[PDB]
């Protein structure tokens, strides 16, 4: 059908890729494959190498330094293409077979193998002031010709191509997310229950989140407001565990409940990026060069493996809060509140 080409400024080597994106399931990730066609007249001794780098930009879009370069690599895999690695056999797929059948015998293939527990391609929001490369983990495939592995990769005689790895939501939804906590004050031992539940476990990008809530205000107190917020917890794990708590969407419910009363109605939420542009630190799922994309789809993780070896993990948990008042003999409108969380998964379908 159609295969992508980058056609390096040297005009000699061109990288051919099957799919720009790459689906990564719960356990197995679709391998990448392609070929490169380089004019063999020039390549007398110089060897052509291709590579894939899982970059990690964190130092904004500031100017480059003498040796800082404000970058970090998570996984880098290089292979030799000219010659086509006679030492290691290449199990070329049908796409590779058709692709070098279309081209000549001088075209050379390449292949990598993504390991499972890696972050999906998510780029942090650059914001207004930043001008240049965006933050966040990013996949890049570049092809250059160099007889030495440590030799300089001259951009005038090299090429690069951008890859994103994406996850697709499971066909079978998980259990219904329900969580009801309770707590009382020192005035009396009559705690109140916050029955909070959702509709499903997997939601689609733009699908209306429908939070089901039910209050039981047995305590002799009032509820001024109910804080409903769907937040995005981005566990940025590179040298630390700086879990962010940016609220993607939130709403306020002014449904006061009398003491010794119960009340319940379903609220609707929709996470979207139209009004959250200016909020820096938001996680955006994938960027090719600068094209707009959605919020970060929640990353699927498999239990039993280490969760502390991953670059950026985005997980969504809608948080329900209710705020009360401590008025009485000695008190004012200011008081405390109790929070119970509700995890949910927000990702794309699997077409």
């Amino acid at each position: 059908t159609r295969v992508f080409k980058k056609a390096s400024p040297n005009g000699k080597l061109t990288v051919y890729l099957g799919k720009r994106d790459f689906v990564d399931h719960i356990d197995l990730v679709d391998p990448v494959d392609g070929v490169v066609l380089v004019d063999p007249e020039y390549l007398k001794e110089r060897r052509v190498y291709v590579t894939l780098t899982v970059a990690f930009r964190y130092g904004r879009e500031d100017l480059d330094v003498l040796g800082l370069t404000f970058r970090k690599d998570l996984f880098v895999a290089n292979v030799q293409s000219f010659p086509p690695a006679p030492e290691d056999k290449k199990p070329l797929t049908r796409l590779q077979e058709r692709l070098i059948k279309k081209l000549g015998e001088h075209a050379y293939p390449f292949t990598f193998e993504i390991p499972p527990n890696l972050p999906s391609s998510v780029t942090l929001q650059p914001g207004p002031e930043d001008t240049g490369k965006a933050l966040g983990v990013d996949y890049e495939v570049k092809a250059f010709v160099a007889e030495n592995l440590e030799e300089k990769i001259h951009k005038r005689n090299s090429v690069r191509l951008v890859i994103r790895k994406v996850q697709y939501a499971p066909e079978r939804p998980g259990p219904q997310p329900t969580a009801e906590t309770t707590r009382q004050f020192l005035m009396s031992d009559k705690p109140l229950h916050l029955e909070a539940s959702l509709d499903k476990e997997i939601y689609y990008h733009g699908e209306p989140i429908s939070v089901n809530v039910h209050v039981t205000n047995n305590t002799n107190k009032t509820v001024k407001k109910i804080k409903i917020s769907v937040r995005q917890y981005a566990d940025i794990v590179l040298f630390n565990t700086a879990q962010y708590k940016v609220p993607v969407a939130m709403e306020e419910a002014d449904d006061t409940v009398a003491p010794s009363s119960t009340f319940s109605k379903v609220y609707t939420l929709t996470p979207f990026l139209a009004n959250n542009r200016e909020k820096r630190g938001l996680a955006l799922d994938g960027k090719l060069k600068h094209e707009d994309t959605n919020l970060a789809s929640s990353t699927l993780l498999r239990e039993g493996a280490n969760r502390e070896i991953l670059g950026i993990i985005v997980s969504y948990k809608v948080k329900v809060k209710l705020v009360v008042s401590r008025g009485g003999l000695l008190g004012d409108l200011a008081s405390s509140d109790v929070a119970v969380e509700l995890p949910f998964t927000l990702m794309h379908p699997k077409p």
């Epitope: 059908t1 159609r2 209306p208 929709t270 990026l273 542009r277 707009d292 959605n294 794309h348």
Partner: single-chain antibody, 225 residues
């Protein structure tokens, strides 16, 4: 699962018109709303489109900034407010829906509001007309001035009814359409084939590109007997 479209009618030259278009059962933050014009016995013409997810407002070259917009997501309604209609505005306007994520052609179309008043990629279609009986092999080719990445969906419009797509991205046919329909990609020239010309299949076909904003329809090919 359908969409409604209203607000059109007779409007004097230089007037205004707030065309209302609403979708039932569609989240606005997962479906974009698009508007395509159509003159009397001519080709389609895209005028504007709005995607609520990014808050972006794309305009056509002819009515760039001269056509007001107003939409809300609580009522799942997008209103088309007109301003200073010219002589070229005497055209029936069709509100349409395409998947706001991973665009795959304007899938669900409205009934079309008929009003009357009193570089740019230019894809070309060939043949401009055809006449065939049942079972005759018919191939219709659309040629694009600048090459695209197979980002073309093919549509079947009968006389009067709302045009509907059959195959998106020129490769994959939509559900609900018989398998006898297909398409092909050949460089910058785009063709689709039909095996048997059934009485329902005897309808005008339209091609359009959506790789580069603004989108632009073909020339319009009429199928006769």
């Amino acid at each position: 699962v359908q969409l409604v479209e209203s607000g059109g009618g007779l409007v004097q030259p230089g007037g205004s018109l707030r065309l209302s278009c609403a979708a039932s059962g569609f989240n606005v933050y997962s479906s974009s709303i698009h508007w395509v014009r159509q003159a009397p016995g001519k080709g389609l013409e895209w005028v504007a489109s709005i995607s609520s997810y990014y808050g972006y407002t794309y305009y056509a070259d002819s009515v760039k900034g001269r056509f007001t917009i107003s939409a809300d997501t609580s009522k799942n309604t997008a209103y088309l407010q007109m301003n200073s209609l010219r002589a070229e505005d005497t055209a029936v306007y069709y509100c349409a829906r395409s998947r706001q994520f991973w665009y795959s052609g304007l899938d669900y179309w409205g009934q079309g509001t008929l009003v009357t008043v009193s570089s740019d990629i230019q894809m070309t279609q060939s043949p401009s007309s055809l006449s065939a009986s049942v079972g005759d092999r018919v191939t219709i080719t659309c040629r694009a001035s600048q090459s695209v990445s197979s980002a073309v969906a093919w549509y079947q419009q009968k006389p009067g009814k709302a045009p509907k797509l059959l195959i998106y991205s020129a490769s994959s046919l939509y559900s609900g359409v018989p398998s006898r329909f297909s398409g092909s990609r050949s460089g910058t020239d785009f063709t689709l084939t039909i095996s048997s010309l059934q009485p329902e299949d005897f309808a005008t076909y339209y091609c359009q590109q959506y790789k580069y904003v603004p989108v632009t329809f073909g020339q319009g090919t009429k199928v006769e007997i």
